[PDB]
Symmetry: D2
Subunit: 472 residues, 4 copies
């Protein structure tokens, strides 16, 4: 006789699996007690989480609204239709001119499905170089010829770079490379670029070379929705994105695409219309994915309602103000940040004038509950180790921090790199020598204590600190 539904199927997690419950509670405390500066990280809302953890996971719904493979989809269809319509609203798109597919499981699935829809295998693609701040999904191969990204495995990629002196995208060199290489797809957007993008110039270049133009706005999508960044939809054919990061939603992806008549073009028929919609939907399903994750789609619909509010626009402004305040604090102490400022959510800190690598600063910061990541500076790939760190404002801004709180984060960071220099001075630059300073270091222990006391004093979206298992 089967174990009754009430026993295996309705009992709470704490009773069914205490081991996993305890680990989630330790993770909740860790999220409270640290300074989260990873620029792709955020803390999403309880309401998002409630839709994410729901019976929507129980429904297979292959196809799209109106064109499903089987039945029972009356309410899945309303949810997905509402999610699509809220996505277009949040990004201020006319539905007569733009559509969206909200089924991609995450950002990288969204990008590969866009490529699969738009290109043939082996077609040429250009994206921002990884050491210049691009993302793996935009193409990456090593100097030894090893194809790392599946984009470089299944297509033919060539990167473009920032100017090695200024840290800005070298638009003239990109134009020159694209005229030589003739990509079928030109990608803009990136993961570690501290300035806004000139989409109008990308459109000029794409038109010269005959390329499709795609923007991957994953890192900045919250700023785009809030009209706190340049609008890629004004110039790009397709726009991909994650829904987490600065949009503060669940982990998922979206693909936006143009619809309707095409703008006037050289020697090509009158009345021509875009033909992206069917290709993109078909690439997502049946080509690449299986059943949608309807709980993710439901949670995304919640996130998009939350993003299309006056409150979210104030958040987006504060994210930017906090990044500027942190960058200015660091610069005031003599530190050097790439381009000497920022226009978005992140700062790139050049550690070479300190004689440090980002590997050392990242390792020491992680030991005092500050999470950031090493990052190449000025597009360099010849340095043994990356010469900088990337630091982002979205996550701590979501916990209510404002400029003065980010200036205190700046001083914690200044303390961290001072300790890092102290270790390197005492023990040396070699990592097995540097590691000697990371154990039994009372100054490091004290910085960890200060960081955790600071972090633990702010609110937290998504769960109630007052009810968590580990409150200290």
């Amino acid at each position: 006789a089967m174990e009754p539904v009430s026993s295996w199927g309705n009992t709470s997690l704490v009773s069914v699996d205490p081991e996993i419950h305890d680990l989630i509670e330790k993770e909740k405390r860790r999220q409270c007690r640290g300074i989260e500066l990873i620029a792709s990280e955020n803390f999403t809302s309880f309401a998002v989480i409630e839709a994410l953890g729901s019976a929507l996971t129980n429904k297979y719904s292959e196809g799209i609204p109106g064109n499903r493979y089987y039945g029972g989809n009356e309410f899945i269809d309303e949810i997905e239709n509402l999610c699509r319509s809220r996505a277009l609203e949040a990004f201020h798109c006319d539905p007569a001119a733009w559509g969206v597919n909200v089924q991609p499981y995450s950002g990288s699935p969204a990008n590969f499905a866009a490529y699969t829809a738009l290109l043939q295998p082996h077609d040429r693609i250009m994206g921002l170089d990884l050491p210049s701040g691009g993302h793996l999904t935009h193409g990456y191969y090593t100097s030894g010829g090893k194809k790392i990204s599946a984009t470089s495995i299944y297509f033919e990629s060539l990167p473009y770079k920032v100017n090695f002196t200024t840290g800005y995208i070298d638009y003239d060199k990109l134009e020159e490379k694209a005229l030589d290489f003739r990509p079928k797809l030109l990608i803009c957007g990136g993961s570690a670029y501290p300035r806004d993008w000139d989409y109008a110039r990308f459109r000029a270049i794409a038109d010269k070379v005959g390329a499709l133009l795609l923007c991957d706005m994953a890192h900045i999508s919250g700023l785009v929705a809030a009209q706190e960044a340049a609008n890629p939809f004004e110039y790009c054919d397709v726009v991909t994105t994650t829904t987490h990061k600065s949009l503060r939603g669940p982990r998922a992806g979206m693909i936006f695409y143009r619809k309707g008549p095409k703008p006037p073009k050289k020697g090509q028929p009158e009345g021509a219309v875009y033909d992206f919609e069917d290709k993109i939907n078909f690439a997502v399903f049946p080509a690449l994915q299986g059943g949608p994750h309807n709980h993710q789609i439901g949670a995304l619909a919640v996130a998009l309602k939350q993003a299309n509010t006056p409150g979210f626009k104030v958040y987006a402004k504060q994210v930017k103000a906090n990044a500027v305040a942190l960058g200015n604090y660091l610069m005031s102490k003599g530190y050097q940040i790439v381009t000497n400022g920022t226009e978005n959510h992140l700062v790139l800190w050049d550690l070479r004038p300190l004689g440090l690598t980002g590997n050392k600063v990242e390792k020491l910061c992680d030991l005092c509950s500050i999470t950031l990541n090493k990052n190449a500076v000025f597009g360099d790939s010849s340095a043994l180790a990356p010469g900088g760190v990337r630091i982002g404002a979205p996550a701590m801004t979501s916990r209510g921090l404002v400029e003065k709180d980010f200036e205190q984060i700046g001083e914690f960071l200044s303390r961290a790199v001072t300790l890092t220099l102290d270790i390197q001075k005492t023990y040396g630059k070699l990592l097995k020598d540097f590691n000697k300073g990371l154990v039994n270091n009372k100054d490091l222990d004290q910085l960890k204590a200060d960081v955790e006391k600071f972090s633990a004093s702010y609110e937290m979206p998504g769960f109630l600190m007052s009810e968590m298992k580990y409150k200290d």
Copy 2:
């Protein structure tokens, strides 16, 4: 001034987004007031759902445990390590001989990651034909040459088929085709095959052509774990799977791969070891995916603990017994099911002797709250419309139903097919004429009321019916 954190960030869904809360409540009612017979569907536990909706969604953890790109992953690592060890335990794998990657976002990403790891672009692949019960991810192109599956877009696929007459896999024709085509990868496993798989013969055939052998056990993984189906790990190089369907977990995928010393093969260096682990891990990340969905991984760990219990084995046996009881009931009424029985969780009902297409039955059933799906029968890819339906036992067995209950489902299905025949008699075979009978049909109305009364009488996992909005 920013909105307080508590306002946007801690308020419940019912208050933040009443529209979406209301649609989830309507869907909750729909799930426990219908007869869910879609063979890939199941109803997972509240414990899984609680880990799924958790703060684990807030952590980026690119890499694998012990080799992460970022810091702060001390507890993510413990969760993923526990998930991996529980997956190996559920499927009775020696960790010295098998590893697993639990990051694939779903079943289809798991398969494409496995192909990326093991194959070069345009390498040849063979899998069960979609009309014979295979899955899209095993390859599919149309008679017109259109490449539908990404597997057929980026690789070179060729399907193998069931026997036209018996409905069993034709292993002799498969071996003949594999000798001619010389796949680099032979895929076993399927989505609509009602019998178990001769893995030993797949290994014999793979060895004759020097192919890798992969089993996609997505549909039967719960039966495999409970040792209620033959074990593909005994013979396959790699096993991919979903974690929902018969395994009753979250939507996610896993890739299992051999590790350690290889068994003897002529032309193989003494001491040779498998080299799958690094290639599979690398294909998942950095090649294809980005950050893992750690809430899925935590929820999967819960599901794998629940699966590795005596209770789950009782469930898996009951799923099979319910599928048999339903198949036997239909055959007792004179209906025809493919291979005249089943060895797993599903039954294929051949509707051709009735003069009915699968879509007519699927449509009428959906209007009386019975969800199944049309399905080709005996590998047929000529017929205008599929000639059968596929019915699965996992989801309703999860609501506590046993053989007698599945015999009542059988009577509901008999009534549905009778009503379909009645409409076809009166309005005709053209779908545009048939549809006229689906409106203002008092027989159809009554069948729906009966089905929903029936479905209402059983328990429901994952949420409390006593708390739902629409009772």
Copy 3:
């Protein structure tokens, strides 16, 4: 000062390069003192050879008539236009329905240019399996997965086979395979098939799968021109060929292609015309080849004028009659030939009922001035060594031999096989042991003397035996 023009530039070969002159003279003697049974070989006319060795080699003429890259092509254009129209005439083609490109350097270039014109890289192709009598250029990979043919390197091939019992093409199994594999191109034609081809059935199969249909008629082109074989042009979209072999011309290739209105079809616009011409021309140049070999094209024009005569049809009839006579002779001695006959220029002799490999017979025959070649039988690839030999009539028919002379060739072959059996009896079946009987063998010596006396008694086209350096 430079060497005077008349010294290096006008002096005869005999004086400029006595070493090569001597070698050509030894090869001329070899050609008219042996029995040439290689089914792909012929002996061409002096008039072809005079055009082949001419000042036409000095002219670069990239492009096609009416559309060259260079000037100075007035007379080259006239020659190439003549050659094209003579090609269409020789194969009874309406020039409104068919065109031809005569620039391919040889047969294998003609095939690859056709694939490049018609297909995308990695498209699927089906041709007759090499062990079933197909050609390497139709696709060939080993059981170990080694891609041997460029066709299998750059495209995706799958072969079809003869019936393993009867030796005929298994058309039902071909249709079954084509429906599964769905090639974009189906190839017919072969190098070692003793029967004619059911082109109507290939067309029915190609239409069922939507394939283009190509005939590589290289081996039988002279028979086709003479209307002594079924006409591939009635059913195939494209026909490729060598111009040597049974057509008796220089070594070159041609690609014929349909032009003008298409036959009725589903989903095809009314008034649709074939679109092969520009693609095939462009594939030959600029895609694959460089300057045409105008001496080849001039020599080909001569051969096509010679092929379109009553006398050539009599020759083609005689070729067939001689192959049948030889096959009948062998069968009357108890030997076995595949399909128990022939309908074209060649015979496939099954040596397995004699306990012999084709390798042994080919080697002993070669030492006795009989040239043929080993060949698989009944499509077998599992054997160690091929179990048969292929024998063709075109070359010795060109020296004037008729049925009774080919029956004498049969008796030489019987003697050769009897000698091979005697050697195998004395020295063994292992090839290394067998070879011991091929040195200082009195009966081998005698058979060689008799073969060469026989061969020397016939006329020889292409050069004057009365003027050659080595007459005895």
Copy 4:
């Protein structure tokens, strides 16, 4: 009842095919009554032509010497062995360190076989841009992305260019592009570059990216053999070539390749040996070609003996001296040539200061029996039409012309461009209007008469003007 062998088979071309005989005679007169300035053109010897037009055309010899598929090859083997040894000797190669395959049907087949042997489909290749003086076989795709060369269809090509100001190869931009693109094969060699090549620098660049280094020496091979050009074999892995053009042989190709121990390198296993020989032979046959053209191989053997003489070195010196004399003559009259000189067999004349396109000069020259061709200048591809012409010295040098005679060619070319300007002045720059001056133009008729009288005063290799049908 066959036609007698002597009738179709031994009768002379003049009797068998008067139409073709007549056209070859017209082409013979055209060759020795005009000024041949096509830099890829030459006039080969009668001795070469005698081997080219010979019974060697009758022999199938698939395989290589010592590894043939069937028999009868005793003398074909001696010829091909002698051809290969004479090729290595003419290019001063140690046969322990270099091998050669002499079967490629022409230059473009030689290149594609080398690519098939060395590379996988879609591998990256870099070669000199067509507008910068490269060859189609090195890669070519249009600005619209149309893949023109098979090299660009089956592989992934990217060109490098000359400096737009100086006309020399821009080695710095080449190294920059190779570092970004990471080709598997770097190609040097070209069709319209007037300076020598820095092979040592190409090797430095190839080593930085791990590429193979191939030289296509087709245009300069006679200079390389004569040690009148830098030696590509010192630095390249593989060298391909035509055998016509400056080497003055038949139309054929060769692939040379290193063998034996590899030179020391970092990360290179000790004792490493080259692995090209089998891959290249196998690519030529069976992968790409069928039977060798043994008449081309014999004619090539002749040409290689003629090339390895002191007389040929004086020819190569004179070719270069004649190109310099012509370039200096044009510069003395105020014309501009690219790089202000030449180091090889050709000159590039920049017509832009005159307001002329090469199209107009080439067409007017063709009308007065001067054959040259238009050519892009300084790597420009933006012009509506090329701004230069390319002029080569090999063909007229082979008819015995020396510096004084090339200065008369220079004055003839000055007269041609002066008349071209006259037509343009009176009718206009639109080629539609320009053509109005090319008919019934008295100065144009007189220049033609002066050119043909001059040309008739020189000797002619390959045939006897005293025996030709169409004398003056």
